[PDB]
Symmetry: D2
Subunit: 194 residues, 4 copies
């Protein structure tokens, strides 16, 4: 039902920022496994909720969140990366300046909170429709970003960088900005503002 999306580029297209092997494992092993497990979990949850099997439905929650979140997060991440992703739209850049001062400031602040994640997780730039502002946040494990529309995510599970950067998470978080797909991020921003 839920399916593994093809990448919008080939496995080596993000070198030298992220290696072919990192991408191939990340897509073919991690994302594929989140999808396969999600489909199994979702079927079980459908059954449990329909039947009012309440203990079971509650028991399935951590697995739905983890595999479902895995699918949500990685699907967004692939669209967020490009060999040549361009620059923010004028509208996005103007809003970055409003809410963070400059793109430089945003990159520093998001990189810092992302680097600081204890264990596995994600950093996010998002847009909050209620307060009409850009925000930055982190999520543990595969918890999906909630409370704001996701625009740009940075995966800091060790599987996202270890083969190439080894322990040096900061160099990966800083380098990923080189392959940020600003065309996609800008499109997500435009959609979030409607």
């Amino acid at each position: 039902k839920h399916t593994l999306p093809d990448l919008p580029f080939d496995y080596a297209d993000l070198e030298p920022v992220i290696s072919h092997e990192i991408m191939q494992l990340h897509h073919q092993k991690f994302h594929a496994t989140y999808v396969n497990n999600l489909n199994q979990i979702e079927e079980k949850l459908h059954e449990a909720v329909s039947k009012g099997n309440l203990k079971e439905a509650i028991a399935l929650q951590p697995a739905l969140k983890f595999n479902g979140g895995g699918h949500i997060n990685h699907s967004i991440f692939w669209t967020n990366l490009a060999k040549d992703g361009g620059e923010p739209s004028k509208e996005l850049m103007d809003t970055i300046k409003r809410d963070f001062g400059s793109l430089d400031n945003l990159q520093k602040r998001l990189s810092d909170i992302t680097i600081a994640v204890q264990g596995s997780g994600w950093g996010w730039l998002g847009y909050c429709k209620k307060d009409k502002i850009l925000k930055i946040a982190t999520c543990a494990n595969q918890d999906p970003l909630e409370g704001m529309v996701p625009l740009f995510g940075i995966d800091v599970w060790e599987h996202a960088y270890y083969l190439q950067y080894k322990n040096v998470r900061p160099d990966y978080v800083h380098a990923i900005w080189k392959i940020a797909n600003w065309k996609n991020i800008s499109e997500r921003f435009a959609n979030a503002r409607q």
Copy 2:
């Protein structure tokens, strides 16, 4: 659809251990509200799952756990209380001695962890089917007991005691043993060993 179970006794039947005013509010307001909200949340979850709306389904998890757990926990709780509880079955008493040394020891150890809950929650005596042993545990808020079969629960949300005992939670926890429905607890134990 889920329904509010009738109490197996009248609202004043557990005095002087738990007051009629505590019991009326506990069942007619709290449990009723958990049931009403549970039915609505379960409908929204079924809709999200049916649509394959993964973010929405994941977002409803805390509400299902809280109200579903509220329903599970209070349903067990009413069956666990009696003016004329009796004493543990021979097999439950034998197992209490095997796993805790004595009933006195069990009561002290469960009372202590229950009194120590920070904020709202529950203390439980349960039976672990895998290791075939009795265990004690606490749960936060309305999280249902998982990983073992619930036998006897003690609600330490302030609404369970504040009108009568005020801040003196230990007096309530120590006193609740006088109305532990050992007939029901023994039945739950027998079922857990099947």
Copy 3:
């Protein structure tokens, strides 16, 4: 050593919004107990740290957070309540309009998140020094507000309202605005902007 602050009013001075019986128990039993336990935990933590007993120091963390937070939160809370609160300072009102549109909007939004706390906890209006904006948040149990400067807090532990309002938490949260000490909240805001 930490000390229980005197209330800046008598126990019945906030009637009919909060009862004298609620106030007496809240300050003389709860806050006093958080202070007494805090002093003992802080002594044990200092001993563990002095000895370099890392496991022991880490093990005391939840108790320090709970009782230390209890002390921090209630200390702020008493200063945040007044029979004659006044109104927001001109600069705080201007900032409320800037960040929430109106005081009415702020009150609704904070009341809503506060009423929604699952279990025990607090709702807060705070000021974020980094982004130089007002924010609203909730905290579980006695966790102190972090990441922003606390301006106004609403305690939704059941002990804060149950004797008077019973299960009807929304009536208490809506009513507390009538005794919000805007003189103190405005002073806290001015200090936060220094």
Copy 4:
């Protein structure tokens, strides 16, 4: 103050189960960094607790637990691994049989819960002094094992296996039993029983 312990073997001595590069980074980068950060955090905490700077002391908790736990966990882990670690002591084997049925059953059960960790963490065999039984548990991130004496730990942060096993955590968890230092584990068991 706290210091990085030398390994009790050379970096390549656990091949082909764990590679030289994995060990070298794990010790020289991860453990060293936990130690360096711990020392800085512990100094700050000492100051904050002495002075009753309560907000600060509470703020430092997640960092003490993470880096302090990192030091605790890795220090135990190195002693738990050996090229030729021998077999359990007669006393440990007898207790394994009592509490788990067989060593085979223990290995399956601990491997399963360890494999199932969502995100980063550790699996543990420990000994509970109160109930006088072996138990198995998992811990998130670098949280140290609490409530029982640690005997054998299995690190399933991705940095512990990714360079060699890539995504295949189960093969690493299963293979690590080949290099379990049963001499050390047995000594820890003997000490825990006193």
